[PDB]
Amino acid sequence: TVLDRQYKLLTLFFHPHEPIHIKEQQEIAASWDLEKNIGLYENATAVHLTIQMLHNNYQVPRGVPFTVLESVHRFEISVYYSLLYSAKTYDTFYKTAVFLRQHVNENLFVNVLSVVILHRSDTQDIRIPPIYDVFPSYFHNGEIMTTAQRITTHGQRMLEHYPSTYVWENNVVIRHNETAWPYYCNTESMPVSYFTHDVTLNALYYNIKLAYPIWLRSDACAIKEKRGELFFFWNKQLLARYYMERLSVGLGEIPELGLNEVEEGYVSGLLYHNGIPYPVRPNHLVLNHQTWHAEAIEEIEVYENRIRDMIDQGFYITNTGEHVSINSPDSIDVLGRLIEANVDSPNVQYYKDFISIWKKVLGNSLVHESVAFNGIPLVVPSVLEQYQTALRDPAYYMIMKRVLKLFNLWHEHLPHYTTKELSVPSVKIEKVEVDKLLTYFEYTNFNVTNHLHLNEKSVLVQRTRLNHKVFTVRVNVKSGVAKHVTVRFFLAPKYDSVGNEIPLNVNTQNFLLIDIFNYELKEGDNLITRVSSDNLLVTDEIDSASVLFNKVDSALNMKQNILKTPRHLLLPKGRVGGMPFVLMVYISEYHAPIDNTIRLTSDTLGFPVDRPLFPWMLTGVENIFLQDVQIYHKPT
Amino acid sequence: NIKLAYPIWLRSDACAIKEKRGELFFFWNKQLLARYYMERLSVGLGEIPELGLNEVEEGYVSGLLYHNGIPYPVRPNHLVLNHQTWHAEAIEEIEVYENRIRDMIDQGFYITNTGEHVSINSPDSIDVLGRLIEANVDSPNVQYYKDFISIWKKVLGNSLVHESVAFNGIPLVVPSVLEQYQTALRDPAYYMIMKRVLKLFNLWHEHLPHYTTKELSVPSVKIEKVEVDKLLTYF
Amino acid sequence: EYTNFNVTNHLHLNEKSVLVQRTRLNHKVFTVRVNVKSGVAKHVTVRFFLAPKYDSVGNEIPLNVNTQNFLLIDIFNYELKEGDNLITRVSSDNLLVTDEIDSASVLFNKVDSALNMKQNILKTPRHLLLPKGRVGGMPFVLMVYISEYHAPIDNTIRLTSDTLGFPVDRPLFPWMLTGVENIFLQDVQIYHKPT
Numbered sequence A: 001t002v003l004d005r006q007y008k009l010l011t012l013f014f015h016p017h018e019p020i021h022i023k024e025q026q027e028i029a030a031s032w033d034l035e036k037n038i039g040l041y042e043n044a045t046a047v048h049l050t051i052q053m054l055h056n057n058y059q060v061p062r063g064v065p066f067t068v069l070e071s072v073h074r075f076e077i078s079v080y081y082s083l084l085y086s087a088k089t090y091d092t093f094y095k096t097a098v099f100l101r102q103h104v105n106e107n108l109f110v111n112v113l114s115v116v117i118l119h120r121s122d123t124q125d126i127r128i129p130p131i132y133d134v135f136p137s138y139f140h141n142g143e144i145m146t147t148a149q150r151i152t153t154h155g156q157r158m159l160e161h162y163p164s165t166y167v168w169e170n171n172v173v174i175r176h177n178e179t180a181w182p183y184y185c186n187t188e189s190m191p192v193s194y195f196t197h198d199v200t201l202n203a204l205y206y207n208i209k210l211a212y213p214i215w216l217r218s219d220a221c222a223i224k225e226k227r228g229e230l231f232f233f234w235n236k237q238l239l240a241r242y243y244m245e246r247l248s249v250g251l252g253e254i255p256e257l258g259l260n261e262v263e264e265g266y267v268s269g270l271l272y273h274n275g276i277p278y279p280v281r282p283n284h285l286v287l288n289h290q291t292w293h294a295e296a297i298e299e300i301e302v303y304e305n306r307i308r309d310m311i312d313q314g315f316y317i318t319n320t321g322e323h324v325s326i327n328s329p330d331s332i333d334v335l336g337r338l339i340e341a342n343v344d345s346p347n348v349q350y351y352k353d354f355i356s357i358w359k360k361v362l363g364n365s366l367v368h369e370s371v372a373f374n375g376i377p378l379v380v381p382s383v384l385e386q387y388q389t390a391l392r393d394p395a396y397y398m399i400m401k402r403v404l405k406l407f408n409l410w411h412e413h414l415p416h417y418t419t420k421e422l423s424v425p426s427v428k429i430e431k432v433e434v435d436k437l438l439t440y441f442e443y444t445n446f447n448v449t450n451h452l453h454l455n456e457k458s459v460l461v462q463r464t465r466l467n468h469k470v471f472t473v474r475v476n477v478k479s480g481v482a483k484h485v486t487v488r489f490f491l492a493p494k495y496d497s498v499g500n501e502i503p504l505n506v507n508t509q510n511f512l513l514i515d516i517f518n519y520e521l522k523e524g525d526n527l528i529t530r531v532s533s534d535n536l537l538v539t540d541e542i543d544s545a546s547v548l549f550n551k552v553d554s555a556l557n558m559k560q561n562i563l564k565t566p567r568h569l570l571l572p573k574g575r576v577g578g579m580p581f582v583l584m585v586y587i588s589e590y591h592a593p594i595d596n597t598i599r600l601t602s603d604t605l606g607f608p609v610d611r612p613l614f615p616w617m618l619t620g621v622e623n624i625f626l627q628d629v630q631i632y633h634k635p636t
Numbered sequence B: 001n002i003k004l005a006y007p008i009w010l011r012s013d014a015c016a017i018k019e020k021r022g023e024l025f026f027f028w029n030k031q032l033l034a035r036y037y038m039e040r041l042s043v044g045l046g047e048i049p050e051l052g053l054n055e056v057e058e059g060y061v062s063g064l065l066y067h068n069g070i071p072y073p074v075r076p077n078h079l080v081l082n083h084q085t086w087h088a089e090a091i092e093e094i095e096v097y098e099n100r101i102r103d104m105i106d107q108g109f110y111i112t113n114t115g116e117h118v119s120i121n122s123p124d125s126i127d128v129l130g131r132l133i134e135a136n137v138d139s140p141n142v143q144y145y146k147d148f149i150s151i152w153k154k155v156l157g158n159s160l161v162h163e164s165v166a167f168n169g170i171p172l173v174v175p176s177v178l179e180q181y182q183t184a185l186r187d188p189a190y191y192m193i194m195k196r197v198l199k200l201f202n203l204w205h206e207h208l209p210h211y212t213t214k215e216l217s218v219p220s221v222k223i224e225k226v227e228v229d230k231l232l233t234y235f
Numbered sequence C: 001e002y003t004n005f006n007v008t009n010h011l012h013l014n015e016k017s018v019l020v021q022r023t024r025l026n027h028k029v030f031t032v033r034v035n036v037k038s039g040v041a042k043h044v045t046v047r048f049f050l051a052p053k054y055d056s057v058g059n060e061i062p063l064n065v066n067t068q069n070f071l072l073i074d075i076f077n078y079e080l081k082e083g084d085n086l087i088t089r090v091s092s093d094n095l096l097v098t099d100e101i102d103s104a105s106v107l108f109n110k111v112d113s114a115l116n117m118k119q120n121i122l123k124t125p126r127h128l129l130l131p132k133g134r135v136g137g138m139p140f141v142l143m144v145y146i147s148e149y150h151a152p153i154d155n156t157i158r159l160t161s162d163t164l165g166f167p168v169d170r171p172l173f174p175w176m177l178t179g180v181e182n183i184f185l186q187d188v189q190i191y192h193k194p195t
Ligand SMILES: *[C@@H]1O[C@H](CO)[C@@H](O[C@@H]2O[C@H](CO)[C@@H](O[C@@H]3O[C@H](CO[C@H]4O[C@H](CO[C@H]5O[C@H](CO)[C@@H](O)[C@H](O)[C@@H]5O)[C@@H](O)[C@H](O[C@H]5O[C@H](CO)[C@@H](O)[C@H](O)[C@@H]5O)[C@@H]4O)[C@@H](O)[C@H](O[C@H]4O[C@H](CO)[C@@H](O)[C@H](O)[C@@H]4O[C@H]4O[C@H](CO)[C@@H](O)[C@H](O)[C@@H]4O[C@H]4O[C@H](CO)[C@@H](O)[C@H](O)[C@@H]4O)[C@@H]3O)[C@H](O)[C@H]2NC(C)=O)[C@H](O)[C@H]1NC(C)=O
Pocket: A043, A045, A046, A049, A078, A079, A082, A083, A318, A319, A320, A342, A343, A344, A345, A346, A347, A348, A349
């Protein structure tokens, strides 16, 4: 019965903005009544709250932007999640989903239903469609969407007048985004536009926040996920990759964010479904004038000073006034939880969310204090207030760099690793060599037909993306005696924006983990010959909505999880003629430990680059090797 | 439609030469600004803000979209004009041109394209004064008296100049509301700029002799009483 | 490459020769060959200009803007025959750029022991003529312009009577270069040898 259930849940994601077209779903929406069917829900309080909200009309109006950073939106989405998750039977769950689809905003319903499907036992096999297919308007420029609407409604008669559009195959018409948006931010935004505007990266951020919502309290499974450590590690990896891209395109180090003025602005060029332009941050934005920006920055400074005091003093304050030490090396998780100010933080009243205030300030979304129903505020969020568009703005990377400065301060106070924790007896690496590192640009097609308001075709968008050829890394190692070992590869830049070789201690923060795997080392001489195509950290493209629908309706793979980095974004572009980089191979013992499942050997994720490392403490540690490589770009 | 009737790029003929282009410009701008000030007083917004050369407090968000779907440029609140931006150079050029206009007004004459002095002290020189201020194709000397109002519009439109060209030729531009006559009036900055130009015009008019009791009087005509029946407005 | 400079004249000798080693840019000899139809026989002047092709961001710079960025690298005379011709200019022959002047020690030796006219104090050094470029190639634009020969030691420089920056002193547009066939714009790549 998997196929039919998946088909129905897909039909729930066919046209969010438009109303229900399938008749029996209308019958269910008109027939079901929560009041009399309270007995089928475990959480009766959620049922009462939902009934009250739906009766008083105290809900976010339909056809309006939705943001989780607003309090009332969080309350509404949490209540709906509690109601949906408390469904005893799958039938009750589906019937509540239909009713909410009828009586709930599109974005909120999609998000809550996806979260419920991911975290429900009865729906551990259902596959949810990609976000960039349900709402294409968050990943393509407004001109593209308007042209799509025109070419569709024209009946493809004036389409042949358009030279940009073309018919690649029957029933599909494709455009070019190569020639468009001549007006753009420029500054530091254009050279890295092939990485920051990538659809897959924003989709990955959205899916990550689907797996770990800020408004959802962890269960036994989510309590072993080490939420804070994942936050820190993922932010570090993203910032290291972004810095590598900037060095590749010659833009320099990530600008440091102050408290007086921000020089770089952002113009999104995106449009909401209704047609409201996004807020724009001007260049040379002033933060020390008579504006709400000043008050927001003062609150941000207070909260960050509280975090700094907690880090330095070595303990945090409970909600009653007790001191809880965080000086042990295993307190990184609670530190991250406190910094994030999620619902799992011990004390959110004193440790508040300054990152959201940073996002509000640097989004320059004019607060007009407008409310509907004498209730829910009406907000026009900027790109930074949406996880599916935040990564397009450099300000996000600047803010995360500040948070990573806080994290580095905390890690600095920790004792440095010893020659016993960081050494494996009688394992010496001889030589490490990669076959080649080449990158090239290629074309890809995305389906944006779900935005078209069909009455009674399939428009696609062509985009340019980076990719790399398969590469093999071969290392020879002395093994001493037989062992079961783990090998980790790290990649870092070798020269900074000016030309001086970066010391290893500084590079410790710029090392990007690209592969980790097990091996059984024999006695004597060995050979590791890892191929990039075998790594499980990076995955291939997930099947599109159309492909999944075809494979389902016509009637598995475990190499496509929503919480993995796309393969084509693993390797930096480099330069034509070669760009130098540093590879680091580290071998350690194997210390023995589907929607949201990731686990490796029990140890800090960034080991051994989480703490600062110095050359003088690597003498006597032979199982770590630092080689130099060159990354090339194939021009086309 | 007004700019259709008197395009800046069209030279006047016998009919358009009797239209007194400059006087029409001055009169229409004065009427528009007086009506706008009356509206502001009616809605309790106060006097029209005076435009400086350092910072503009009031911004504008149009909410309009072009046919293709490109959003209009947005001017932020508290825009800074004395930083390391092209705004500073534009403002410097504007100041130079306005100082040239002020010197021409005060000295009582304007300079021809050859270097001759032509007096503008008579009361009938308002037309040529307006033509010079507008810097249209009918101005005697556009090379020395240049169009600072267009530079003001460019500066206060905050249209990011990206120096993009097609055909190795025609630049591609995304104009703001102030650069289009069909959308300029939506922005208060237009009224501020026109108030500055009207300050220049008032300076010129102040230098003129005041009317006498002979020019301003009609023999044996006395008004007794004036009364209107009612003045009501509705939406 | 490395070069040595003599700084002994600063030393306050009482009753040696210290030198300083410095790194400088240089280029290998290059030859430019152009084929031209000549019509009838003439005495002509050929000028070469070099400019960048892309700006700091990546957009191709329009010719009008590049008019201010054109660097004159060579100017010389020729006698064009009738029919097909061939110019084969070698960088080592240009008189605009000169070689290093003899140092004080070298000049003192050559004088006390007991001419050349390719060393004037008012000429650009040869090794600074060509931009460094990039490893892997950097695109640039060469412009060859041919005009008529309009007939015109310490401080002496004179060429055909005309504006020095002709024809790049005034702005130039593509649409006004139709009908002018004696001007050609080619693209080249400059490479840097890493060491
Ligand atoms: C079915 O559906 C419903 C609706 O969908 C779901 O209901 C939600 O359920 C969750 C979980 O139960 C609730 O969250 C918790 O709520 C309680 C109660 O908060 C309410 O009352 C507060 C006022 O009383 C509190 O303060 C007074 C003094 O002023 C005090 O006398 C009283 O005893 C009590 O402490 C309100 O303040 C509060 O909201 C107000 O304040 C909020 C904060 O400023 C503000 O945001 C609101 O807008 C409003 O202004 C609310 O009305 C909370 O006590 C509890 O708080 C814990 O977690 C937060 C972080 O989320 C943390 O900051 C707190 O310090 C506290 O942390 C303790 O518990 C954590 C786990 O919950 C734990 O991880 C911490 O370590 C800590 O516990 C450990 O340490 C502490 C000492 O630090 C120790 O005491 C403990 O024993 C332990 O050792 C949560 O916020 C939602 O409120 C509720 N929402 C609704 C709409 O119903 C329901 O979950 C669903 N059920 C099922 C089965 O699915």
